[PDB]
Symmetry: C2
Subunit: 240 residues, 2 copies
């Protein structure tokens, strides 16, 4: 078994080497008011991780638009990183624009509790907000490439719940009960739950299930763009 | 921080009370050569969790077809569980077939490292994916306020099943990957002659010694996977809010 940071806790304060330079976390991003997704890997020159980088690369401006920086992590040198970035541009055509924390020894992997033993593990994703608090954590195994578009869905939807003070429901914007409807936090008191029904200002299925549709059309369609893209069988392969 | 199990550990041997009775973990599901997915929940009669149950239900056949059982967990009584299921049958119109582990106080949940509190049970939102040798293969910790994408869980188990069955790894976004589309990856070589021999066979399409692949997944396999994602993607025709004054 093993220890890790927890959702809702503030990202582990740390100073790190990336192949764009030394920076601090979560500070580098908090200062700028940007969110970041942090995503980890066992070693460079791994094919699954290669496809993941290429997939993150393609959706780079997508993340920028949201107010969301990317940062990878593997337990090799910065030199290993650079050579691998070169290999991908040269052999695949795609330039990787995001930084990559370099963590030989696995000190950062260990610090963050991706390492506990074998490196071997370590396909973790952290989504940190701009108060620098952890919001979501995915652990996909090494043998299973991530679905990068769902990552986009999760940040978009978190941002949107934060801004409007709404919870968000299974599969949103295509939820089968309420569609692109967001959910109103349940009422902690009984005089709140009561006056929430007789108000008639939300659409309720009971005191504790009320929702509206305050998300604009462009937040909704962006979110669906993300999924359709995931669903789409791709036009041209990049191998040929 | 908190302690949790690890990908590639055995699921903790334990016995849980559910609304379907006592069931034993992971043995019960290992006993039938069955994968299982376990998803946790802070309390009964909560909105997001309700929409995840419904979602999960509506996909039960997809799961049953894959060889994958479902089991939920929330910190409330078997009374509430069952009462919450009646509510969803009476108000949404959907019968939740699967069991829900009863765990008020929340010991079963602490035992899994799904809460690290205190009293405040806001945190209890994980999904374990456990295979048929009873071993954890994947774990997702969404937050309370953000419902999951169930078609993505379907994708994972599909991908994992195929990987093991074909001895392949699975690319980013599979079956709709940018570089290799539906292709699956050949486990990178360990030694020097392994790298040379493989190029001197052309049995795989290959960018460099450590990036070879083939397309071994049968159309069937690939089409159902794609169907998971389309379903995800499509704006729904009928909403169950409306098809429910009936």
């Amino acid at each position: 078994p093993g220890s890790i940071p927890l959702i809702g806790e503030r990202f582990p304060e740390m100073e790190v080497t990336t192949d764009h330079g030394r920076i601090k976390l979560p500070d580098h991003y908090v200062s700028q008011g940007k969110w970041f997704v942090l995503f980890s890997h066992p070693a460079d020159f791994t094919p699954v991780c290669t496809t993941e980088f290429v997939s993150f690369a393609r959706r780079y401006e997508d993340f920028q638009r949201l107010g969301v920086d990317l940062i990878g992590l593997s337990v090799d040198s910065v030199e290993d990183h650079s050579a691998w970035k070169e290999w991908i541009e040269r052999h695949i055509g795609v330039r990787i624009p995001f930084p990559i924390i370099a963590d030989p020894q696995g000190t950062v992997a260990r610090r963050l509790g991706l390492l506990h033993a074998a490196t071997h593990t370590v396909r973790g994703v952290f989504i940190v907000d701009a108060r620098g608090v952890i919001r979501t954590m995915l652990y996909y195994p090494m043998e299973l490439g991530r679905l990068v578009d769902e990552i986009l869905r999760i940040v978009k939807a978190l941002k949107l719940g934060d801004s409007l003070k709404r919870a968000v429901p299974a599969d949103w914007p295509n939820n089968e009960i309420i569609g692109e409807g967001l959910i109103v936090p349940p009422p902690t008191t009984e005089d709140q739950a009561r006056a929430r029904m007789e108000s008639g200002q939300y659409r309720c299925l009971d005191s504790w299930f009320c929702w509206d549709t305050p998300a604009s059309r462009d937040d909704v369609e962006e979110a669906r763009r993300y999924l359709r893209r995931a669903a789409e069988k791709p036009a041209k392969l990049l191998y040929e």
